[PDB]
Amino acid sequence: SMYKLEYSTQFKKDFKKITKMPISDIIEVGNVISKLQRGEKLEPKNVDHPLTGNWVGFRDCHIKPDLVLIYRVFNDQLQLARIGSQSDLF
Amino acid sequence: SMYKLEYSTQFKKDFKKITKMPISDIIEVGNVISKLQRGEKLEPKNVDHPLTGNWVGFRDCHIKPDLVLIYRVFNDQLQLARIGSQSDLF
Amino acid sequence: SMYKLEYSTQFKKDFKKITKMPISDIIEVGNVISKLQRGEKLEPKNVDHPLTGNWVGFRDCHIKPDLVLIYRVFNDQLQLARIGSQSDLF
Amino acid sequence: SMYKLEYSTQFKKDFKKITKMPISDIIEVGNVISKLQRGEKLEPKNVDHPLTGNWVGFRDCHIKPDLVLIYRVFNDQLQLARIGSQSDLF
Amino acid sequence: SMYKLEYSTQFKKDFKKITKMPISDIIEVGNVISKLQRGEKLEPKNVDHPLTGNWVGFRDCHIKPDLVLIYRVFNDQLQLARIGSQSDLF
Amino acid sequence: SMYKLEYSTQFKKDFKKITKMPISDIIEVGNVISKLQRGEKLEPKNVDHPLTGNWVGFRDCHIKPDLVLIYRVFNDQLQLARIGSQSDLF
Amino acid sequence: SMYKLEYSTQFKKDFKKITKMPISDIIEVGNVISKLQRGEKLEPKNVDHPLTGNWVGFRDCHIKPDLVLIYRVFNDQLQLARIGSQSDLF
Amino acid sequence: SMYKLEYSTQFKKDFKKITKMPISDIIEVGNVISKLQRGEKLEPKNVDHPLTGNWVGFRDCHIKPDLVLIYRVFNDQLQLARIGSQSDLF
Amino acid sequence: MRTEMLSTRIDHDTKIAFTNVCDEMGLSTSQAIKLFAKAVINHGGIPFELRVPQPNEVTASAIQELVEGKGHKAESVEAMLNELTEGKV
Amino acid sequence: TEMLSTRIDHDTKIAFTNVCDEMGLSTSQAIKLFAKAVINHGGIPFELRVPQPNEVTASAIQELVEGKGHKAESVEAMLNELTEGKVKHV
Amino acid sequence: TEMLSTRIDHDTKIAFTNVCDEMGLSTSQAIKLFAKAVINHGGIPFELRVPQPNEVTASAIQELVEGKGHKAESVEAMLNELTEGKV
Amino acid sequence: MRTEMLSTRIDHDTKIAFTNVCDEMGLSTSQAIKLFAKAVINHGGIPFELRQPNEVTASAIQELVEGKGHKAESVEAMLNELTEGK
Amino acid sequence: MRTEMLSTRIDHDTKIAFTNVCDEMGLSTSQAIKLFAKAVINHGGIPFELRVPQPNEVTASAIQELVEGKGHKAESVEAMLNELTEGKV
Amino acid sequence: MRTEMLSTRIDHDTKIAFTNVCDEMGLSTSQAIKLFAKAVINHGGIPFELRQPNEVTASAIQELVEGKGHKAESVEAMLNELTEGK
Amino acid sequence: TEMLSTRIDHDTKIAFTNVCDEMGLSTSQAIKLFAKAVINHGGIPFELRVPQPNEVTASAIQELVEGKGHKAESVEAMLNELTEGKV
Amino acid sequence: TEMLSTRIDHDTKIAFTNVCDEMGLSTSQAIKLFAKAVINHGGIPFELRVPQPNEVTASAIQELVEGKGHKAESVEAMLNELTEGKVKHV
């Protein structure tokens, strides 16, 4: 948990939708965020990549094929911008 | 030994976007450009290849899968035309 | 004064075909090129214009409706790329 | 005092098909040939033009929309190569 | 008198969407269909016309600029194939 | 005596962004809403139309080319669902 | 047992060309059509398959690789639309 | 040699070009014609097939990939129409 | 800096139908026209084939079902609306 | 020189050969034309698509589906009429 | 090597396979061509289907249809409230 | 007949380039724009590659970039609060 | 039976350049226009993308050789014509 | 300015169909024909499928069909005559 | 199964291979797509190169350029001879 | 339900995923859209082609080839200016 953890207001509002998912999926969200907090590279299926265009400076990982986390590491802080479907986030 | 460094006006504009990326990624951009300046061969993941148009020998390589550098070596000049996503360049 | 005359290897090969034309038509080609070398505006029938395609600044004029010259002025140089029919060039 | 008249052997063979045509059309062929022999401009509908394809060095005019004459003026000679439809000549 | 009314299975499914419209708009759909059943010419705003594509004799009219009816008259039968937006149908 | 006025919660949230706009634009929003409340035709530039997509049962008009109001008249009520740009509403 | 035989006007026109073929080939055309009339399955070389358009179930089979029959079975009718080369039909 | 042998005037004129070919090629022309005269099926490489369009009623075989024979069997007679390249014959 | 205007004359039906598609696509009409103009410059041509409306697969199947005589009858426009609107009248 | 080739089935081989011959091209010339066109265009210079009936075919299909075809009691009687007596049986 | 994949229903897979067969390619080759085209254009080079419903707009509409909107006496009163006095 | 205008503001450089490409193709800019509008209607969509903007994501990113995000003591504490105990 | 006329207004340069391509293709201009009209009816649209002239590969290579500074010099138009016409003057 | 006319005769049915397809695409038949001519020039060729006629082959086929071909006693005799002894 | 094949020079094969690679297909797949397109359109769906020279026209031109044409005194005399008296 | 899939390399997988996410689509949604579009159109509804630079890229390339680029003595000094000091080395 080397980085500090910060999240947007919108991230909390997104997590109201995430809360409705099965417990397994919620823990997998937490496991991905924990990997990111420790600075660890994600799995190939997470297709982790930097964002282009207006979203430049931020990254996107697939926790599930249709469940995307938008985040960045800035200074010493893992910042969580949004979590949701491709259609909800872009 | 090393090529002269030349960049387009648009390249400077593109680097305004590049500046918003984390320092790690900016350093990777610099590392690729420096390899090219030394005339060295790039690594397979950079998928360096010439473009097959009337593009006077310009080339395309991936600094990241969605971060493309358009460039050429002419005389003893490394000329940097664009840097950005496929959507920005094509 | 006048620009330097320069022609491509392919322009020489194209002229292998142009030479078969009557001497009058060959002279008319030469007259158009002489105008271009002196910075003279061509005649309305020459439909002189820059190409908007992938042409890197090159221009198109008609010595005849079906005899096209592809050329540019770079520095103080009249560079002649091709001469031939629309089918030969496009 | 006009140009001298010359025709190819193949032109003589083509004229068998021309002879099969109505007198009106044969006369129109003769009228175009006389205009060319006198150096006179043909009508807009004859779309007289130099050839820049396989028959470079020669000209073609349309005596009818589907009846083409391939010819040239070389020095003081009007030389008639072929007469027929677009398919039989190209 | 009047043609027989016939509608496709897909027309019923499309009407699952049309029913959500205000009652006035639903009546206007019904009025256009009633005109067609009685062989009446539609109004200029209905842009009634046969489709020139692969449509097997079917026609297109606009109940609204973005609400299209695909239909035909065969024998004495008004056959209704689809109703919906241009995006739903084409 | 005009239609009753109703707006959604989300419409109230959208109006925070509207409040950030110049007074001129806010007033133009109010003017369109009053026209709709009185049952009056909007101007051609408002391109008022019923929706036949995901928001079937509702109408949209353009208060500005990039500022859209989604609304309906249901019985004696003018109901205002959203106001914003095309991207935020569709 | 057997389907009713129906053919288009254009089919009769096409058979004017078919008539010029040798008797052997005309007999092969007849043999294929008779197999279809009996509802039988064709042989692999006839590459019988439905067309994938809005073609109301019409099918394509090769009596020869360059002799195509367009047909359908509707009710108890074998309906023959076209016979000819790919260039005549498509 | 069961069929009688007949050839067009144009076939003889074509054979003046064929005569210039090596002896091996001329004999192979004769071998194909002999197969046809005996009613024998040709080899797969001869891609023997009936002609469509204006040439219907006649057949085409490749004696070489760019050497085509146009022929037919009519009554008891093998009739040879033309021999030459695809560009010469079509 | 300098700004000009690009425009065309079109009838009302076209303007509304085009506006509706653009709205459903998340675009203003001005944005859409600028995208077309830029795409034409980028491609050196119109980057799609010009064509008439063509039925999508669902439409083609509806048409074939009708042409095969497999449609569903209705006694009148009113009864049809009542059934398919499930009573909305 | 090296080779470009593809493996194809017999029906495709013959149908392609017929179109190519009738266009005045050997198979090799046609493939060379395609490869050079792909180079010239930087892509396949046409849309890939399934066969689509031309207007004449669509007309025949429309005549049939509207019940306006021509009846025949047997393949044999149909052959007698469409061949004008050339093939009176089978 | 990795995969680009989707689940489709049976009828769609049949129709897609048949169309590709008539064009002369396999479904895998067709999908690879699509992916490379999307990369080469930096976008999807053809018309998109009407998007998934904007949930924000959908909820606003559902609230209104369920009769749960907020009444206002006037446009002026509404603007005063929703602009917090700016107009 | 009832015709209206369909129009956009565009930069001068863009106007020139678009006009020149249309000239080489043999049509006017007005005709080209009408062709585009009818094509969009005929396809029920824009038949070539677009851009997507998203206001919600843009605001979230902007809030974080301005240093106004919310701290969490651990992933476990964050999940516990944001799931309300799940 | 009934015959009409299809026409367009084009400048002289276009008419001759188009006529020359059609002749080289073995077609009259009337035949070519009828083929286009029939192809448009057949396809329900224009069966090619509209675009500006684009250099073929030989042209692109000529341009790149010039842009790379690898062209061949000539002292004057007259000497150039003399060399490349091999004395035709 | 120097403009000329480019024109064809076409059947009435063809005219109607072509006009209707052009209407649905949003352009006039004159504009469509200009677009075709410029496209043919811009590509140096016709950018879609043609038809090929051949007068020589047509005459040869017609001569045979009319029963006017030349008899040969055998393939060997034919080759001997047509190759002048090769 | 049979083949569609041609011999090309080395440079052309290289360029064709590279273009197909950028599109995401092999040269064999590209040529199969071309063959099926040619069949599906019943013609070649793009512009043809200027054809091989019509040998009849080429020989007529060569005869004239070599100075071997037939002189005529007049257009009327020419027409009388070449029409065998019809004009 | 069954599956449509293709094997792709890592660079292609990520570059495609970025375009798809930024278009508001999961990979599955994008492939389903393509397959349904191919069905709807009876073909691939776009030309296959290599990447082609947009106007901005062509402009940068033209500026460079005309010698109007901007010099820099090292990758490091270039990074300092283009990032406005954010990355002053490597």
Side-chain angles (χ1 to χ4, degrees), chain B residues 45-62:
Chain B
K45 64 179 180 180
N46 296 121
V47 281
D48 193 53
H49 66 276
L51 308 118
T52 56
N54 188 26
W55 295 107
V56 202
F58 274 77
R59 301 170 60 87
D60 166 327
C61 73
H62 291 183

Side-chain angles (χ1 to χ4, degrees), chain H residues 16-46:
Chain H
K16 297 164 59 289
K17 199 163 144 112
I18 289 326
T19 295
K20 283 163 186 198
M21 307 186 156
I23 273 280
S24 76
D25 285 327
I26 304 180
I27 287 126
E28 184 60 15
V29 167
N31 287 343
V32 167
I33 301 176
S34 293
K35 286 206 187 150
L36 289 175
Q37 193 177 24
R38 296 185 297 262
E40 285 157 20
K41 162 177 223 170
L42 304 191
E43 301 193 323
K45 71 170 201 313
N46 297 125

Side-chain angles (χ1 to χ4, degrees), chain H residues 1-80:
Chain H
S1 71
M2 266 318 123
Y3 296 130
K4 316 287 170 143
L5 208 65
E6 282 194 89
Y7 60 89
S8 71
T9 317
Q10 187 52 52
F11 186 82
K12 177 161 128 145
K13 303 201 191 124
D14 296 342
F15 231 86
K16 297 164 59 289
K17 199 163 144 112
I18 289 326
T19 295
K20 283 163 186 198
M21 307 186 156
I23 273 280
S24 76
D25 285 327
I26 304 180
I27 287 126
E28 184 60 15
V29 167
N31 287 343
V32 167
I33 301 176
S34 293
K35 286 206 187 150
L36 289 175
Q37 193 177 24
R38 296 185 297 262
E40 285 157 20
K41 162 177 223 170
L42 304 191
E43 301 193 323
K45 71 170 201 313
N46 297 125
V47 289
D48 196 38
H49 65 281
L51 289 162
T52 78
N54 195 37
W55 310 137
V56 77
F58 276 84
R59 280 182 79 72
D60 147 17
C61 68
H62 292 187
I63 297 159
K64 301 169 84 33
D66 64 354
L67 182 59
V68 157
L69 175 72
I70 296 172
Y71 72 94
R72 80 173 172 168
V73 168
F74 173 85
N75 232 340
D76 190 51
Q77 282 81 37
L78 168 65
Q79 308 181 330
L80 312 169

